[PDB]
Write a protein that binds this ligand. Structure first.
Ligand SMILES: C[N+](C)(CC[C@H](CSc1ccccc1)Nc1ccc(S(=O)(=O)NC(=O)c2ccc(N3CCN(Cc4ccccc4-c4ccc(Cl)cc4)CC3)cc2)cc1[N+](=O)[O-])CC(=O)O
Length: 140
């Protein structure tokens, strides 16, 4: 019912489309509110966005460790919607950088990592905080 997998796929498709790359359930109201919040996050936290984009040194064998290290740091002091939006933007940076560095094979892997983290680690918090509808109530 949270449909976190399709939320991830639609989000990553949008991020890759913004950079000119074509790649591969909840209301459009949720999908559009999330992508607008993520665009706004990265224009508000531009230095952070740019630093993350620059300092990722992706290879296939180390990309998961990069993902897991950053996500643990992001949620170390707990979960809030803003950090969830930052998590989506981070996955979008990892996907775009993968395509830029001729490692496009990583995009489907990163999408799986994101869906899995939502389902296994953020699911309880999302349900307890009123689901994706509550995200829209606050930030739509
Ligand atoms: C106009 N619009 C769209 C405004 C939407 C509004 C502002 S946009 C925004 C702002 C902050 C977070 C997300 C979106 N949204 C918002 C505002 C506050 C909040 S909130 O819950 O009070 N949280 C915060 O304000 C917040 C602010 C900053 C946050 N980060 C967390 C990430 N951190 C860098 C970082 C640290 C550790 C690990 C990774 C990173 C990192 C992660 C990703 C990248 Cl690309 C780069 C670095 C930088 C600071 C995290 C949360 C949440 C949202 N939201 O979820 O959409 C509708 C409206 O009017 O409400």
């Amino acid at each position: 019912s949270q449909d976190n997998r399709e939320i991830v796929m639609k989000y990553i498709s949008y991020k890759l489309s913004q950079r000119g790359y074509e790649w591969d359930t909840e209301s459009e109201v949720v999908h559009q509110t999330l992508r607008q919040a993520g665009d706004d996050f990265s224009l508000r936290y531009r230095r952070d966005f740019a630093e993350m984009s620059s300092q990722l040194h992706l290879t296939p064998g180390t990309a998961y460790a990069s993902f897991a290290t950053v996500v643990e740091e992001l949620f170390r002091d707990g979960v809030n919607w803003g950090r969830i939006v930052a998590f989506f933007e981070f996955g979008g940076v990892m996907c775009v950088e993968s395509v830029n560095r001729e490692m496009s094979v990583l995009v489907d892997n990163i999408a799986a990592w994101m869906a899995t983290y939502l389902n296994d680690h953020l699911h309880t918090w999302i349900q307890d905080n009123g689901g994706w509808d509550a995200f829209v109530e606050l930030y739509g």
